[PDB]
Design a protein around this nucleic acid. Structure first.
Lengths: 85, 209, 48, 98
DNA sequence: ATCAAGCTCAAGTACTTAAGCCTGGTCTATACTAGT
RNA sequence: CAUAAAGACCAGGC
DNA sequence: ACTAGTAAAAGTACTTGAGCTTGAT
């Protein structure tokens, strides 16, 4: 409800727009400093002074407005925003 | 109506008779126990279009230890008093050569008249009272102790047999109704004699400023 | 302020200079005065 | 729910605001537009983790106009201390009034 | 007949104020921009 | 011997 | 890119506002 009910970014000749569509939630996963994923346990979060949080992904669509008789929209999937505990 | 107003004039007159009796003047005993009927038969029945006018109620009294010192008591006619009436009374005091005066004001004053009462300070000292204030003698009340004004030699033995200065006494401002009852200016010491439950009697002193 | 009065500035820049010098010598003695939005250094913490 | 939702709208607004502020500088040149580098990710993560970590239910740079005392440390003496601390209400009337 | 001078009383708008002493805890130093 | 800063909030004791 | 500058009553104290008295007329 928060990512849907948001004002778009209409701004300008060509101009680029993007919209947020549907949101996806994963279970918590530890991203180690070398860049490796693993599902982390809460006891591992206590003992190592970590955070027991899960990353958040979303879809973005993109439209161009130039009126050169070509409306090329580019769709995206699973764009990383942040981490929710 | 009129019976309440002549009741007020009797009670004000009796209050002034104890007042100048307490300041140290010569007051006959017959007008201190003056019952309402002797007032009502002497001066008149009703002041409503009547014989006590608020004129011919004036009282001139004389001091005991010196026959020169006299005091006049004025009962003004109009409710609030301006400067012109104060110049009338001050004119009568000018031609009759009297210094002290009281003005029993009916309803109130005007502030330029009050400034016209504080400005002639070294001569012609006039005092201002109110009709609502003079219906009860505050010296006879339950809470109010005995005040005795002290002469200068007695102030010298106070400030000499306690080894004080003059500012090291307790104080009293000259605007409370008791120091206006006794007519006390700045620089004078009143003696207060009050009974206490620890010793039996306690005498304290106050400097008026 | 000293070099900008020794170089002959526009004399309306100086008003925004003596105004802020008034603020910076007048906060150090009395910070919690009503009005006059407070001075602060770090984490939004106002000064002592 | 109705505290982390209020905490989440104010950091979806902020992230879209720096999407705009990154967007305007990259559009005066008219080159192209990108979003995998436009999204600064420390806003939501460091904001939720900040205002859960320290109590002050607001921002970091407004750390004195905030209602503190929410999100405090769990209590672990006895098991009923814990069950009481996880079931606790609170009213925001100040605690010097009489 | 109105006209200033000087003064008093009343209402409107800010500043200043709230028990003593003692023991443990967690978190934080600014996120953002130009020198280099 | 010397060195262990300091501020903000919170939960408590009489 | 790396890293250093950086914007609740409740007492009093002061101000304005309306109207008065009075000398002038």
């Amino acid at each position: 409800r928060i990512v849907e009910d948001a004002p778009p970014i209409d701004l300008q000749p060509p101009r680029y727009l993007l919209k947020f569509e549907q949101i996806y939630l994963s279970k918590p996963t530890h991203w180690e400093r070398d860049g490796a994923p693993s599902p982390m346990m809460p006891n591992e979060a206590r003992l190592r002074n970590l955070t027991y949080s899960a990353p958040l992904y979303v879809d973005i669509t993109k439209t161009v407005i130039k009126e050169g008789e070509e409306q090329l929209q580019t769709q995206h999937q699973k764009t990383f925003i942040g981490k929710i505990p | 109506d009129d019976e309440e107003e002549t009741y007020r004039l009797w009670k004000i007159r009796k209050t002034i008779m104890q007042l100048c009796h307490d300041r140290g003047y010569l007051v006959t005993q017959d007008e201190l126990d003056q019952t309402l009927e002797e007032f009502k038969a002497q001066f008149g029945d009703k002041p409503s279009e009547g014989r006590p006018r608020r004129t011919d109620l004036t009282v001139l009294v004389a001091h005991n230890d010196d026959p020169t010192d006299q005091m006049f008591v004025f009962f003004p006619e109009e409710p609030k008093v301006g400067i012109k009436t104060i110049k009338v009374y001050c004119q009568r005091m000018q031609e009759e050569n009297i210094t002290r005066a009281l003005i029993v004001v009916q309803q109130g004053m005007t502030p330029s008249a009050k400034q016209s009462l504080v400005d002639m300070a070294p001569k012609y000292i006039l005092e201002q009272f109110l009709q609502q204030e003079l219906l009860i003698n505050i010296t006879e009340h339950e809470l109010v102790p005995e005040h005795v004004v002290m002469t200068k030699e007695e102030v010298t033995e106070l400030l000499a047999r306690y080894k004080l200065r003059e500012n090291q006494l307790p104080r009293i401002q000259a605007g409370d109704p008791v120091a206006r009852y006794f007519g006390i200016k700045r620089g004078q010491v009143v003696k207060i004699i009050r009974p206490s439950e620890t010793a039996g009697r306690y005498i304290t002193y106050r400097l008026v400023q | 302020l000293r070099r900008n009065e020794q170089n002959g500035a526009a004399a309306h820049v100086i008003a925004e200079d003596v105004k802020l010098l008034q603020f910076h010598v007048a906060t150090m003695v009395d910070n919690e005065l009503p009005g006059l939005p407070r001075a602060m250094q770090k984490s939004g913490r106002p000064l002592k | 729910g109705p505290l982390l939702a209020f905490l989440f709208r104010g950091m979806f607004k902020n992230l879209l605001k720096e999407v705009r502020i990154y967007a305007q500088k990259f559009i005066d040149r008219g080159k192209d537009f990108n979003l995998e580098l436009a999204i600064k990710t420390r806003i939501i993560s460091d904001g939720l983790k900040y205002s859960l970590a320290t109590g002050n239910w607001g921002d970091q740079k407004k750390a004195h106009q905030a209602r503190a005392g929410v999100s405090q440390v769990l209590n672990r003496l006895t098991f009923a201390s814990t069950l009481s601390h996880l079931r606790r209400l609170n009213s925001p009337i100040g605690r010097d009034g009489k």
